[PDB]
Design a protein around this ligand. Sequence first.
Ligand SMILES: CO[C@H]1C[C@@H](C)O[C@@H](O[C@@H]2[C@@H](C)[C@H](O[C@H]3C[C@@](C)(OC)[C@H](OC(C)=O)[C@H](C)O3)[C@@H](C)C(=O)O[C@H]([C@H](C)[C@@H](C)O)[C@H](C)[C@H](OC(C)=O)[C@@H](C)C(=O)[C@@](C)(O)C[C@@H]2C)[C@@H]1C
Ligand SMILES: [K+]
Ligand SMILES: [K+]
Ligand SMILES: [K+]
Ligand SMILES: [K+]
Ligand SMILES: [K+]
Ligand SMILES: [Mg+2]
Ligand SMILES: [Mg+2]
Ligand SMILES: [Mg+2]
Ligand SMILES: [Mg+2]
Ligand SMILES: [Mg+2]
Ligand SMILES: [Mg+2]
Ligand SMILES: [Mg+2]
Ligand SMILES: [Mg+2]
Ligand SMILES: [Mg+2]
Ligand SMILES: [Mg+2]
Ligand SMILES: [Mg+2]
Ligand SMILES: [Mg+2]
Ligand SMILES: [Mg+2]
Ligand SMILES: [Mg+2]
Ligand SMILES: [Mg+2]
Ligand SMILES: [Mg+2]
Ligand SMILES: [Mg+2]
Ligand SMILES: [Mg+2]
Ligand SMILES: [Mg+2]
Ligand SMILES: [Mg+2]
Ligand SMILES: [Mg+2]
Ligand SMILES: [Mg+2]
Ligand SMILES: [Mg+2]
Ligand SMILES: [Mg+2]
Ligand SMILES: [Mg+2]
Ligand SMILES: [Mg+2]
Ligand SMILES: [Mg+2]
Ligand SMILES: [Mg+2]
Ligand SMILES: [Mg+2]
Ligand SMILES: [Mg+2]
Ligand SMILES: [Mg+2]
Ligand SMILES: [Mg+2]
Ligand SMILES: [Mg+2]
Ligand SMILES: [Mg+2]
Ligand SMILES: [Mg+2]
Ligand SMILES: [Mg+2]
Ligand SMILES: [Mg+2]
Ligand SMILES: [Mg+2]
Ligand SMILES: [Mg+2]
Ligand code: NA
Ligand code: NA
Ligand code: NA
Ligand code: NA
Ligand code: NA
Ligand code: NA
Ligand code: NA
Ligand code: NA
Lengths: 108, 57, 205, 113, 134
Amino acid sequence: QTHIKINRGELLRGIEQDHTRQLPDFRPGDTVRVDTKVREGNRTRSQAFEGVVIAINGSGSRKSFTVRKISFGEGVERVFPFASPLVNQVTIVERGKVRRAKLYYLRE
Amino acid sequence: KHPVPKKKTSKSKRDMRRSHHALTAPNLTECPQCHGKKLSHHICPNCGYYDGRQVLA
Amino acid sequence: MKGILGTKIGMTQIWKNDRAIPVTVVLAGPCPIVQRKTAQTDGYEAVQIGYAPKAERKVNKPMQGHFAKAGVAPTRILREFRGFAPDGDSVNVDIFAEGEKIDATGTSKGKGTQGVMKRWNFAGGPASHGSKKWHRRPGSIGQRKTPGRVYKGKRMAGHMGMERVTVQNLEVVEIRAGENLILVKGAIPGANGGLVVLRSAAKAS
Amino acid sequence: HGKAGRKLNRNSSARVALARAQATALLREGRIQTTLTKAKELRPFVEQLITTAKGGDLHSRRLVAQDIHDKDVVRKVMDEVAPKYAERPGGYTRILRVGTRRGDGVTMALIEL
Amino acid sequence: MIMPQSRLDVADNSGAREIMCIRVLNSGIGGKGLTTGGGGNKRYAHVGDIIVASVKDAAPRGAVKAGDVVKAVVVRTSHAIKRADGSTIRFDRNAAVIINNQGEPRGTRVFGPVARELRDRRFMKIVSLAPEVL
RNA sequence: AAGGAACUUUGCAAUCUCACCCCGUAACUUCGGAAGAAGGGGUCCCCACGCUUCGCGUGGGGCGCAGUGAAUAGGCCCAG
RNA sequence: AUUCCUUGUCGGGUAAGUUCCGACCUGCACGAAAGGCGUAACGAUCUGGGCGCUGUCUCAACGAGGGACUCGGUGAAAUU
RNA sequence: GAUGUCGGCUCGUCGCAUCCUGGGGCUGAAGAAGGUCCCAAGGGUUGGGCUGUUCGCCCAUUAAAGCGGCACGCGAGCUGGGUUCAGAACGUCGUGAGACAGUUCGGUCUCUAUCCGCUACGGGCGCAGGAGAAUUGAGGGGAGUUGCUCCUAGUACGAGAGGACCGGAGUGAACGGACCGCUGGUCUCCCUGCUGUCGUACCAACGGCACAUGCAGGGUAGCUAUGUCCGGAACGGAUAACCGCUGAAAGCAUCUAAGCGGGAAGCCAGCCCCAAGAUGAGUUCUCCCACUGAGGUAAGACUCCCGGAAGACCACCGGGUUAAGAGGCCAGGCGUGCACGCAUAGCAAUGUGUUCAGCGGACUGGUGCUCAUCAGUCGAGGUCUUGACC
Ligand SMILES: CO[C@H]1C[C@@H](C)O[C@@H](O[C@@H]2[C@@H](C)[C@H](O[C@H]3C[C@@](C)(OC)[C@H](OC(C)=O)[C@H](C)O3)[C@@H](C)C(=O)O[C@H]([C@H](C)[C@@H](C)O)[C@H](C)[C@H](OC(C)=O)[C@@H](C)C(=O)[C@@](C)(O)C[C@@H]2C)[C@@H]1C
Ligand SMILES: [K+]
Ligand SMILES: [K+]
Ligand SMILES: [K+]
Ligand SMILES: [K+]
Ligand SMILES: [K+]
Ligand SMILES: [Mg+2]
Ligand SMILES: [Mg+2]
Ligand SMILES: [Mg+2]
Ligand SMILES: [Mg+2]
Ligand SMILES: [Mg+2]
Ligand SMILES: [Mg+2]
Ligand SMILES: [Mg+2]
Ligand SMILES: [Mg+2]
Ligand SMILES: [Mg+2]
Ligand SMILES: [Mg+2]
Ligand SMILES: [Mg+2]
Ligand SMILES: [Mg+2]
Ligand SMILES: [Mg+2]
Ligand SMILES: [Mg+2]
Ligand SMILES: [Mg+2]
Ligand SMILES: [Mg+2]
Ligand SMILES: [Mg+2]
Ligand SMILES: [Mg+2]
Ligand SMILES: [Mg+2]
Ligand SMILES: [Mg+2]
Ligand SMILES: [Mg+2]
Ligand SMILES: [Mg+2]
Ligand SMILES: [Mg+2]
Ligand SMILES: [Mg+2]
Ligand SMILES: [Mg+2]
Ligand SMILES: [Mg+2]
Ligand SMILES: [Mg+2]
Ligand SMILES: [Mg+2]
Ligand SMILES: [Mg+2]
Ligand SMILES: [Mg+2]
Ligand SMILES: [Mg+2]
Ligand SMILES: [Mg+2]
Ligand SMILES: [Mg+2]
Ligand SMILES: [Mg+2]
Ligand SMILES: [Mg+2]
Ligand SMILES: [Mg+2]
Ligand SMILES: [Mg+2]
Ligand SMILES: [Mg+2]
Ligand SMILES: [Mg+2]
Ligand code: NA
Ligand code: NA
Ligand code: NA
Ligand code: NA
Ligand code: NA
Ligand code: NA
Ligand code: NA
Ligand code: NA
């Protein structure tokens, strides 16, 4: 409707690089994310999720990954914003040999 | 047939309807090459030019 | 009262403190004042304001004349406001603060000729029980021999979309003075590159 | 809405056998006349095809052969046409609209190199 | 989400194995016991939401038998739940914990990881019996 | 997506099932049948050895999410 | 499938059953070749329940194709 | 010479003898919970088992699960379960053919809207000059629900147990509007994998058909609720039941005759949207102007072209070579997930390296390589009267 001369891509980047965070080169194989859990009033907990990355969705602020863990005989997927402030560090446990970027078959 | 009309329509009405059926006259141009009238943004069907000559006469 | 015009640029992620706030980026380019509507000289109080800049080669002689009266520069868009009457021009700085709630209005995307299920929610009919009126197709339209007629201003297929829409109470998360940018928690109507008008909180909590 | 990105006239295999058949045709004949729409649709496909073939690598050729199932033509575009179109940014294809037709009343046009 | 007619797994030793939903309530726990529902609609039971339900298949020898109308709280949905940081959680199966009008668990312990909106919803004792809180 | 007959006069409709080999198979019965009950497993490619020929068996190895890899292809049960 | 009173009374199944199953009895108006009662097998038959599965539903979305819409050509009908 | 029957589904709207919220009087009203009456239709009034059911009973909830009207609203909107077609059967009356206070299984619900009415959208003309744009608002629509918890306060009250009005804060449900950043869906050829067969001579690599994608896996833009954002209100004016002040006729009493105040989810206004055809056709800024004997022209617009988060066609927006509009091309993002070829390892199927490979729709920019060339059509010289002003 308005037709200004302006690159909006770069505009968005500018307001999004301040909320972008770069992580270890994982793609396949396992990971341990050490996350803070401070929503318990005052006490600040720390829990670790360790599983098999199966998602590299997004970029910039919106970038994230999905990891899958079996905890107490029960399937569990988590989804983490690379840039979530309730995430400390992330570590690769081991690398894995796969032929596609999803792995939504590990569910059965 | 459910889609039947009640009364026959009047000449008057039946013509008022048609008051939107008049074809537009093709706005024609003068060809700067073979002085023939042609269709804008097209090729002069006569001499065959369009900035220099493209089609076969 | 106060307000300005800008372009919807897009929505993105943005944590504030410890929480993920969805935001919608808006370009509140500097807005010139082109005409001061004095109630005395007109009939009501108001201010005309311009947005996207245009090439003088594209601007009508008359419109040039308009722009000459204040002498700023030919712009492609003009709109008015209320009670707003400052000096200089209209930059979102000093105008909007981070934390202030704002009414953000614009033209929605339009969906064209949408049925009733889309348009008015409706409900259409059974898809299995043996029909010819599946998906949409409304039921009846009235009663019977009594007002053998359907009510003025009722629910039927039409042009969905293309409407002026004003969403109330949106939070000003962040403001980049100089980059003439503003972030607004949540979604604003219309498409990216759409015109949006950001007005002061009218009747708020 | 409907803010997508391509044209369709028939099904899915169709728009393909089309774009291919016509691309081949034009490449072979250097100019063809067709419906202004079909022309418009062909322009970018074929432009892009020159750019592929415009590589020389056997790969580029084997790519081009997926569309152009005619050998003489693949060789033409590959070794003759592409080469020639080496210095010009991109795409040398143009469209000239002739005029209305009699059979169905459809405006025709010429696409050529 | 959760909605009536919808079979669940039981995350406790209350005796019950699988239970079908009878109606979704509006988890009015707080103050003294459980309170009356914030309405008569609510069509989907989220996590940390109290529902009513019937026992469908239960184990021989247990506190709760087949055919029993009882309230339980939802601990694990396959629907995804979004946390305020921006993250997301979801469990391969849907389960609940049978309770009493005081909101306490009928079992002696909980089986499997429970959500965590449960803590928010002040279900302290459940979180107590719980192996993990994801 | 989540749920799974809540739809409705009625699971109407449309799914699931689906070939061929192997294992296994209730009540009842006119002992023929119920039965293809139900249920479970296998299924491709290469190499070697063996045998009755188009193959098949055994062992080892390889690839994919998946191997009657596409088409042709029973849903089952209880009771009246 | 004879049922009126009646959704009869009890039990079974269901969270909840007017129908369904099993009994009882006051069989309006069952009954032994207009055959009585029962019966394996059979059934595009009729009824009830269950498992699996599903857009049948909560509740709709997206995608495709053939029409609907536009241009050129041909050009009806019931009705009045 | 036809007013189609029950119930459901769909879609509504209206009455008030008001089911719930709102405001009151009275009480055998301590409080809390109720009872009854008066005022009040703004909004709301859940999901299921059985039955063709409308009813009704039951499960589980809810503030509440209101009663009626509209041809017991609605079949040129749907269904066809029920009921008055033809078949068959039971009980049953009749000697019979047949019949019904019966019950039971089965049994074709008609592609095209003329007019009015309704939703969307254009063309003409008008609005005393011809034009570009910004607008006031007469009027008109939408919206209108409500629980729970906390604070006040465990105070008032009450023997106790129990346990407030008022006011002030939080969080839900359902509903609606927008939006696509997230979570997901889809994405009919964007990438990959797989099978049978046919072809490009064969090998290798590919294409086609197996759907109107062969099948499978995944998926950008767009579109989309199950996702998210926001909303219902505060204030104010005039009122209803009702509650009061000053105060006569009854030189007492009295809300009342004069006069005035307070007071409901209702009314009006406030909030969102439309709105000058409001033919009483409104206001403001700016532009071209005082030709010619209907026509050249100015301002300005149209046609035509190229496109578009605009769209049935029209219409609306942008661009049209003093050009960055689209395509292409370049770079980048994103999706797929390691290309062909060659080399190496193995008897082979394969594996490994080259190879963060190759391929590529919609995304974000840049660039004059392509097409928007050229040119035509339309479009003012502004009636009269009265009054005022120099
Ligand atoms: C008062 O208004 C009624 C009166 C009633 C006696 O009759 C109706 O109209 C009848 C008609 C609509 C039929 O309705 C059926 C079904 C039913 C359920 O009602 C909906 C009833 O059935 C019951 C209750 O059992 C009904 C008895 O009979 C219809 C389905 C057809 O059969 O359509 C058929 C087909 C589409 C055709 C096009 O093939 C043709 C149209 C039709 O037939 C023929 C043979 O063409 C036409 C030529 C014709 O003969 C007709 C003119 O007389 C119309 C019929 C008489 C009238 C509206
Ligand atoms: K995704
Ligand atoms: K379907
Ligand atoms: K035609
Ligand atoms: K007899
Ligand atoms: K008004
Ligand atoms: Mg009718
Ligand atoms: Mg009338
Ligand atoms: Mg095909
Ligand atoms: Mg699923
Ligand atoms: Mg299942
Ligand atoms: Mg029902
Ligand atoms: Mg069926
Ligand atoms: Mg098939
Ligand atoms: Mg089949
Ligand atoms: Mg009975
Ligand atoms: Mg019982
Ligand atoms: Mg006899
Ligand atoms: Mg037979
Ligand atoms: Mg049932
Ligand atoms: Mg539907
Ligand atoms: Mg669609
Ligand atoms: Mg008649
Ligand atoms: Mg008639
Ligand atoms: Mg009243
Ligand atoms: Mg009281
Ligand atoms: Mg039933
Ligand atoms: Mg009546
Ligand atoms: Mg009726
Ligand atoms: Mg019937
Ligand atoms: Mg008969
Ligand atoms: Mg039949
Ligand atoms: Mg008409
Ligand atoms: Mg109003
Ligand atoms: Mg909506
Ligand atoms: Mg995106
Ligand atoms: Mg060959
Ligand atoms: Mg080969
Ligand atoms: Mg072929
Ligand atoms: Mg063939
Ligand atoms: Mg075919
Ligand atoms: Mg697919
Ligand atoms: Mg919503
Ligand atoms: Mg291609
Ligand atoms: Mg571009
Ligand atoms: Na196509
Ligand atoms: Na019973
Ligand atoms: Na009402
Ligand atoms: Na009910
Ligand atoms: Na009603
Ligand atoms: Na019809
Ligand atoms: Na037709
Ligand atoms: Na209060």
